[PDB]
Ligand SMILES: Cc1cc2nc3c(=O)[nH]c(=O)nc-3n(C[C@H](O)[C@H](O)[C@H](O)COP(=O)(O)OP(=O)(O)OC[C@H]3O[C@@H](n4cnc5c(N)ncnc54)[C@H](O)[C@@H]3O)c2cc1C
């Protein structure tokens with residue numbers, strides 16, 4: 001409250017996580033400017049039907065492994081948020097033919113096993129690659145290498161399996177994704193292979209609220225944060241930085257002065273025009289910004305008069321093996337999570353997301369009915385009473401859902417993304433050293449970025465040397 005002053009742009013998970021570590025170090029003169037009317041960012045729940053569902057992150061990915069994922073204790077022990085281990089063991093039983101009903105289990109299981117071992121091969125190769133990524137490649141090239149082919153999985157089952165294995169995780173096709181940096185994934189190698197599905201009407205966002213309440217003044221009766229240092233509905237539009245200090249202009253024309261600015265807005269937002277930098281950021285930094293990927297991952301939710309889809313063991317995850325790659329193939333049913341709610345989840349990513357976001361909710365529900373009517377020619381399938389189409393790409397405060405490591409981005413130029421310019425510091429999942437794309441990554445980037453700065457402010461070490 002006296003000493004250097006840091007303005008933190010954004011009250012998402014990395015924004016909150018940074019400001020906490022800052023407060024703890026003694027840097028308590030904090031101003032958090034949050035663009036929307038709530039903290040938590042891409043951890044955001046919403047009312048669908050009569051339930052609360054997640055628009056953003058829904059999983060704690062990487063549990064049960066060699067090292068404790070820091071998100072996990074908070075979820076499972078502290079807040080005891082309702083959640084379920086995901087079981088993908090049965091997918092072979094649950095892949096639907098484009099016209100009429102399920103494939104032969106034994107058949108699918110083979111293609112699965114075959115996919116798995118190509119990826120096991122690519123794991124081995126990845127570990128041999130030079131650390132400069134002089135000799136990195138796309139996941140797809142590794143697939144071609146192994147499958148001895150001009151192309152990757154190119155037939156309806158093979159693709160939806162490919163999609164499940166990759167797109168469903170990184171929101172972009174294997175052919176744009178760097179092998180060296182996704183195969184294998186530090187989230188899973190480090191924290192475990194398991195993923196847990198948070199279904200707790202408090203919201204996964206509860207994790208961020210909780211960390212916020214560690215250091216921000218909250219009302220004793222109500223619980224709401226009331227700390228003057230948190231400023232909602234504050235859209236940062238300009239950042240002026242000289243060696244003297246920094247100016248932050250918001251959209252209602254407020255100008256704040258600080259010693260240092262911590263910027264936690266998504267790589268998507270950074271890629272847009274929303275925040276103008278004066279001076280323009282160095283060419284190196286701009287190049288790093290535009291070369292990395294901000295993927296879109298859309299969780300279409302559906303309400304039904306009755307159920308028509310199998311429930312029971314292995315019935316949560318099913319795929320639709322469309323002849324058109326990435327066309328309503330990934331489906332989730334919620335017998336455990338919201339029983340008996342009668343809702344389905346289809347996921348889409350990337351090119352389909354951008355199409356679907358731009359098109360009428362109506363039109364979309366059309367396309368989905370058609371697919372569902374194809375998948376269960378047997379049953380008598382009612383129209384969905386309600387659809388939900390999260391439009392994160394469209395939203396100017398997000399412009400996507402999480403980062404993806406593309407081919408051609410190496411370790412050096414990844415680091416340039418996170419490297420500070422002057423008194424301008426960056427945090428956010430996209431700056432995470434080993435966990436870009438993830439809640440825990442965003443959380444841990446909070447701490448790291450905070451520490452880079454604490455080192456400058458207190459210990460007077462301010463030249464950050466990129467590697
Ligand atoms: C659809 C979806 C699916 C996902 N699934 C998973 C999952 O299951 N598990 C997992 O771990 N990860 C998943 N994630 C990724 C994970 O949610 C993110 O890595 C993390 O939550 C992002 O936090 P952040 O602090 O890096 O960024 P953000 O949460 O985006 O924080 C930035 C904040 O700044 C605000 N803002 C932006 N611009 C400005 C401005 N100009 N002025 C002031 N404030 C600004 C934003 O509103 C936002 O609150 C998912 C995310 C999405 C959206």
Ligand SMILES: *[C@@H]1O[C@H](CO)[C@@H](O)[C@H](O)[C@H]1NC(C)=O
Nearest residue numbers: 063064072076077080085196
């Ligand atoms: C989480 O909590 C449950 C019930 O509270 C406990 O029994 C279990 O050990 C925990 N699960 C994991 C994966 O750690």
